């Protein structure tokens, strides 16, 4: 008998819907995930437990949780009618499963309905423009070419400027959903002002299309969200993120942006038990509290020059990005 009826029931609908859409590969991944779930003694309610199954990989575990976390209301319609549409809207950039139900709830079933009859975020409007391109994964070597382009344009301004690609790429995975490029300079002074100049040069050359998304400010860190396309025929749009950080925050920014999501989550948990807190900016000691829990002193920031220094302070043996997949 089947224990995980709450997951497979909605996975069967997703698998069927994807085969119809032509994505035969994903439909296979779901079918193999469905089989692994049925052949399990207990119901899965966690990410790690879902991931700790022979048939289920990392990307699949995230989808199960997303499905599991979505849940309710779930009042609307039926899974056969609702789930394929909810998945359809969810894959749009800048859209969540809750946002999807909102549109779905209003009475929207297709992207054209969203294109016209729905209020669009500036980020969401870009999503529809490059929907098919954003929906697919990119080869590793294409991401390698994206890292190189950003690097060459950035190194034009400053010779000592350093660009390192992160995310799925740095972990050595074969395919990447998006590309996150981290930029810094050894002295820690040069990196400033480069962020604005670099985007312009790339935008001028045609590498960046649909340029803007809020450019965000996180203290010293400067992040650009945008889409990019390589020169040449047969090229499709891809998401790019360019982050410029100082050299002091570089070690912790590297660790955070490299991933994985569950890895970082475990690192924060590990840091918390040792009286430290790991942010993307720096590794600092936890906020000092008395016995009763009253905050009596602020935590101080620890010097982490290299990525290895973070591991040593946490008393954890070094793990290379390939072993950070989790």
Swiss-Prot record:
Binding residues annotated for Mn(2+), in chain numbering: 178, 180, 241
Region (Involved in primer binding): 171-180
CC annotations in GO: nucleoplasm; nucleus; site of double-strand break
Biological-process GO terms, alphabetical: base-excision repair, gap-filling; DNA biosynthetic process; DNA replication; double-strand break repair via homologous recombination; double-strand break repair via nonhomologous end joining; nucleotide-excision repair; somatic hypermutation of immunoglobulin genes
Active site (UniProt): 63 (schiff-base intermediate with dna)
Protein residues bound to dCTP: 137, 168-171, 177-180, 264
Region span, DNA-binding: 16-30, 96-99, 217-256
Reaction(s) the record says it catalyses: DNA(n) + a 2'-deoxyribonucleoside 5'-triphosphate = DNA(n+1) + diphosphate
EC assignment: 2.7.7.7, 4.2.99.-
Cell location: Nucleus; Chromosome
Keywords: Chromosome, DNA damage, DNA repair, DNA replication, DNA synthesis, DNA-binding, DNA-directed DNA polymerase, Lyase, Manganese, Metal-binding, Nucleotidyltransferase, Nucleus, Transferase
Obligatory cofactor(s): Mn(2+)
Keyword field contains Metal-binding: yes
Family the entry assigns: Belongs to the DNA polymerase type-X family.
Protein name from the UniProt record: DNA polymerase lambda
Organism: Homo sapiens
């Amino acid at each position: 008998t089947n224990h995980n009826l709450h997951i497979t029931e909605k996975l069967e609908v997703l698998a069927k819907a994807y085969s119809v859409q032509g994505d035969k590969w994903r439909a296979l991944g779901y079918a193999k995930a469905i089989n692994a779930l049925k052949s399990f003694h207990k119901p899965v309610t966690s990410y790690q437990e879902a991931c700790s199954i022979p048939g289920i990989g990392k990307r699949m575990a995230e989808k199960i949780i997303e499905i599991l976390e979505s849940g309710h209301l779930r009042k609307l319609d039926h899974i056969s009618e609702s789930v394929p549409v909810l998945e359809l809207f969810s894959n749009i950039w800048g859209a969540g499963t809750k946002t999807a139900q909102m549109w779905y709830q209003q009475g929207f079933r297709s992207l054209e309905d969203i294109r016209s009859q729905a209020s669009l975020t500036t980020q969401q409007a870009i999503g529809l423009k490059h929907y098919s391109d954003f929906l697919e994964r990119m080869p590793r070597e294409e991401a390698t070419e994206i890292e190189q382009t950003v690097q060459k344009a950035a190194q034009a301004f400053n010779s000592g400027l350093l660009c390192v690609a992160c995310g799925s790429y740095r972990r050595g995975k074969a395919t990447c959903g998006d590309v996150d490029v981290l930029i810094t300079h050894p002295d820690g002074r040069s990196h400033r002002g480069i962020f604005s100049r670099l985007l312009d040069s790339l935008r001028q050359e045609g590498f960046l299309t649909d340029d803007l998304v809020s450019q965000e400010e996180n203290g010293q860190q400067q992040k650009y969200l945008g889409v990019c396309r390589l020169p040449g025929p047969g090229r499709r749009h891809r998401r790019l993120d360019i982050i410029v950080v100082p050299y002091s925050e570089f070690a912790c920014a590297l660790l955070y942006f490299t991933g994985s999501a569950h890895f970082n989550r475990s690192m924060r948990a590990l840091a918390k038990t040792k009286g430290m807190s790991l942010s993307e900016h720096a590794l600092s000691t936890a906020v000092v509290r008395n016995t009763h829990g009253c905050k009596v002193g602020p935590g101080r920031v620890l010097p982490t020059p290299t990525e290895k220094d973070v591991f040593r302070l946490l008393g954890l043996p070094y793990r290379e990005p390939a072993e950070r997949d989790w």
